Amino acid sequence: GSGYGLGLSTRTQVTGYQFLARRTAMALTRWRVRMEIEPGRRQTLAVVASVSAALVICLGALLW
Amino acid sequence: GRSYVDRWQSITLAGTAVIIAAAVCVRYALELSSPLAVSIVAAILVLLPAAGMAAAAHVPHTIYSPLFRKFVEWIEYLCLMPIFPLALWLMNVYAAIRYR
Amino acid sequence: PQAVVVGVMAGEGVQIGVLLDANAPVSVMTDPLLKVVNSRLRELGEAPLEATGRGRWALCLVDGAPLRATQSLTEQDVYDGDRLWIRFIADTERRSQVIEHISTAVASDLSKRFARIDPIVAVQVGASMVATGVVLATGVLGWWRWHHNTWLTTIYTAVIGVLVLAVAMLLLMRAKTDADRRVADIMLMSAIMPVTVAAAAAPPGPVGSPQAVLGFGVLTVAAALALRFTGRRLGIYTTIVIIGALTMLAALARMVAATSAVTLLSSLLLICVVAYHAAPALSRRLASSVRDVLLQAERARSFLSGLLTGLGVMVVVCMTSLCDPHTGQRWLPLILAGFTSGFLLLRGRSYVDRWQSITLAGTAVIIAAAVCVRYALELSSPLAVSIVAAILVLLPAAGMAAAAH
Amino acid sequence: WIRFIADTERRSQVIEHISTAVASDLSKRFARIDPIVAVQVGASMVATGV
Amino acid sequence: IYTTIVIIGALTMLAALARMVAATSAVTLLSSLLLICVVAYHAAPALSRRLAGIRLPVFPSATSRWVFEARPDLPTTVVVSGGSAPVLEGPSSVRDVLLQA
Amino acid sequence: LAGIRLPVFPSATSRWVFEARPDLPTTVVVSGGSAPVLEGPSSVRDVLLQA
Amino acid sequence: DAMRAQFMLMLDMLRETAQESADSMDANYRWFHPAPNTLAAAVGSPRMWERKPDGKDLNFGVVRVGVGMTRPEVTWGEPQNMPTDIELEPVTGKALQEFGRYQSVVYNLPKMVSLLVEPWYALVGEREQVLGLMRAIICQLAFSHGPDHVQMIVVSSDLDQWDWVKWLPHFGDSMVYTSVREFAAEQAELFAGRGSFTPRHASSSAQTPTPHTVIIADVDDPQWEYVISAEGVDGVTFFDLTGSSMWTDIPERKLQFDKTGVIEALPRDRDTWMVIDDKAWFFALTDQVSIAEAEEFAQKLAQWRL
């Protein structure tokens, strides 16, 4: 009980937790939770896009 | 800086952005000394912060169209997208792989 | 000793002299005491004291702290001739509030105790950044004049001085509130530096004594002019005038004729020594009926604080320049610095102001530490540094221990 | 109260007016130094020395 | 103030250590610190949340039914030396959030 | 250049309020017609001049 | 994620609606039952002796003993078409579960006891705690109920503790006794004449006689068995400060004090005062006043008459 240990978990629960975390992270910086638009994710995807673009150039160079 | 509402937390972000510009400008005068550099640096170093004081006092009392507000948002993303591809170039990683 | 006479303060401001029982506990007297002040107010025709909703009547010091209800008036540190205040303190009891969901709970709570950024503060930040920007601009332009005599430094700085002063004038006239005045003052004060180096850089040839005469002169003039027409920020402008004036005398003498720097430095030190005794008099002469007295009091207080700061800066620069680890009787200036520091260290107690007393006390300590550093950099060897380190840590430890122990 | 009235007894019987809200504030707005403050300054100086 | 010292300390240690054992170039070390900081600005609100002890609710993982009204949680009492009278103000689970924030 | 402005916002992040207190009417005077008279809300008068 | 975000927002608006109703209850209850230390300053106001027995006053016979938990005036409706336990979304489920557990009670409200509902109330604890609570009860009653409506009697051996009672008017007559034999001769001859206890209610208050009697037992005399085995008399209520076995044999009439000053008892319904459970539990945090404070309040009250 009480969720102790390392028991298995459902994909519905993974996104569930990840949503409560995003909402709380927003509360610490914007002090509100209405979230009409969610800038937290938009700013994160821009980093993931930059990292991915850098790796693509390496494959091009490696192939050359 | 827009995403932080607390007073000192937001000031430290804006302050970090301005000090980089000022520090890089001065570095270009105390080395590579010449009339252009010392003149240009003296101009940027005084005009750049002045432009901010005007925008800081003027923006809060005006109304802007949603097409423009939606555009400044996209300036941030266009600033992040080039960092990694440029850093790996400065580090010389691509040449090291192409001439493996 | 069975009773004490004290002044009790009541509603809206009436003070009444009363002879209280010195040993009964304070909770026994507040009720009949309240009756007496109300009786006198009623006969005087004033409005009596009254309760409002839920609360209680309490007896407090003029600082507002209430006295412990069970202790005797003699058990507390209350003496004959003191004064007290009778007051009503309201009930603070109310229901407790709960929020379950940590996301909403943190948001609501955090918004109450801390202050968010607003358009009023946004302007003061920009105003501070523009001031920092130009003092950096003058620095590189000044550094260039130190290697080149061309007009560029005066030419380019002159235009900046004009522009910054021009903008400041509009802000001063348009102002409406204290916030608007703060921004205006920060901007005008920033004009003094570019204008100052703009004049000093004009005289051709290598930099030195001849240019120095112009610099510290125009600086002193501008600071005085700003103080006259502004009449605000008294202390800082006062400090600039003093340090500028004394430097102008030294610059003029060295430029005209001077047998040695030691002669000028010794002269300045003596001038400062006598100036400390004159400072309170100078401050005092520099200064509906209530307005005139309070304005006179705060204006006077401000001038002394600024005046003391100006003198403190000069002695440490002079004193540290006079001493030397190799020149002649190396011990003579060391002991002379000690005797000079003792006067300042002891005299600090004669003034009631916290910052005035602290600046005086701090002025002595810095000289002693500065002298040891000078004697550690030069004549460098393990004995020199070993002695200076031990001295610098033991020095203040003994001072605080003697006061706290 | 029961009290002894000596022949020397004299009482003021006079009152004066001043706004209570300002008198209380002026008590702390500015005054002389305190030992706790002196200790804090002392701590800062030895910290600066080391 | 203490958190600032730990970050500049830890990050500088790794740069100094690599320079010692591998003699890597200055351009590689300075550029790598920049990339580490660009991601650090995105993790800051998440690192800050766990360092402070904020705890997200645990999920019941579908081995029990929902109970709408168990007997309510017991309130907690507090005491003060000067304000000698004890007082109560709420459940422990709620009373702590005001300090964690 | 004439200063016409078009407000667009998500209703202040709130539902509508039909009973909100109407704007206070402005008083006007004339040199000859020294007796003051009120003509209407400040927001609506500007439009007649901006146009 | 869009549905999750909408559902959380719908709950916050319910919270705001709940919070406002609770504030109205706080405002009202404080207005009728203030903290014992604040009562002295109110003596001159019209709030003193305000309580009336004439049916419309729902507060008659009610006394404040401390603070604790109580049920809000809100009525929650159960959710319709509930998804089966094997099909619930995990975020909204816990949110709705926790909502029900905490939003069902409001903290720090004044807890109360009714005289018209029980023959006696056994106070069990150390002497210092019990006397603290009893003095508070006397001054709470004294401020809210008039002498024409409440009369009070004390039976005690430690007369040195009740010396302050002298100033109060509720203790007057045309009144402290040393033993049951003494009380039996003077007072019981009048009161024992008729009746036995009968639980009343607000509307019934118009029928009961005006002088309600409060008796405080501080002697532990075994002679009390006569009235106790007869189940008291109507218009009388006893408070036992000793914790004697004849009074202490009924859980529905026993109050237990913890070392921390927390009192435990059986739960009673807010609207009917009827007992709703058979196990004792947390009830209220104790409030208490000193002998000096009691005499101080008593002197202030002694200055006034009808």
Numbering used by the authors:
A (entry chain B1): 10 to 73
B (entry chain DB): 404 to 503
C (entry chain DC): 18 to 304, 344 to 461
D (entry chain DB): 102 to 151
E (entry chain DB): 253 to 353
F (entry chain D1): 303 to 353
G (entry chain C3): 101 to 274, 285 to 416
What does the literature reporting this entry say, word for word?
Specialized protein transport systems—known as type VII secretion systems (T7SSs)—are central to the virulence of this pathogen, and are also crucial for nutrient and metabolite transport across the mycobacterial cell envelope. Mycobacterium tuberculosis encodes five homologous, but functionally distinct, T7SSs that are designated ESX-1 to ESX-5. These systems translocate a number of effector proteins across the unique and impermeable diderm cell envelope. Here we reconstituted the ESX-5 T7SS of M. tuberculosis H37Rv in M. smegmatis to obtain a structural view of the entire T7SS membrane complex from this human pathogen.
Cryo-electron microscopy (cryo-EM) analysis of the M. tuberculosis ESX-5 complex purified in the presence of ADP–AlF3 showed clear hexameric particles. We performed an ab initio reconstruction without symmetry enforcement that yielded an average resolution of approximately 4 Å, which improved to an overall resolution of approximately 3.5 Å after further data processing; this allowed us to build around 78% of the stable complex de novo. The intact machinery comprises EccB5, EccC5, EccD5, EccE5 and MycP5 with a 6:6:12:6:3 stoichiometry resulting in a 2.32-MDa complex that is anchored in the inner membrane through 165 transmembrane helices (TMHs). The membrane assembly is best described as a trimer of dimers, in which each dimer comprises a single copy of MycP5 and two protomers each of one copy of EccB5, EccC5, EccE5 and two copies of EccD5. In the intact ESX-5 complex, the angle between protomers at the membrane level differs by about 0.5°, from 59.7° between protomers of one dimer to 60.2° between protomers of adjacent dimers. However, at the cytosolic level these angles differ by more than 10° (from 65.3° to 54.7°). Beneath the EccB5–MycP5 chamber, dimers of the EccC5 ATPase assemble into three bundles of four transmembrane helices each, which together seal the potential central secretion channel. At the very centre of the complex, one TMH of each bundle contributes to the formation of a pyramidal assembly that aligns with the periplasmic chamber. Individual cytoplasmic EccC5 domains adopt two distinctive conformations that probably reflect different secretion states. Our work provides a fully assembled structure of the ESX-5 inner-membrane complex of M. tuberculosis.
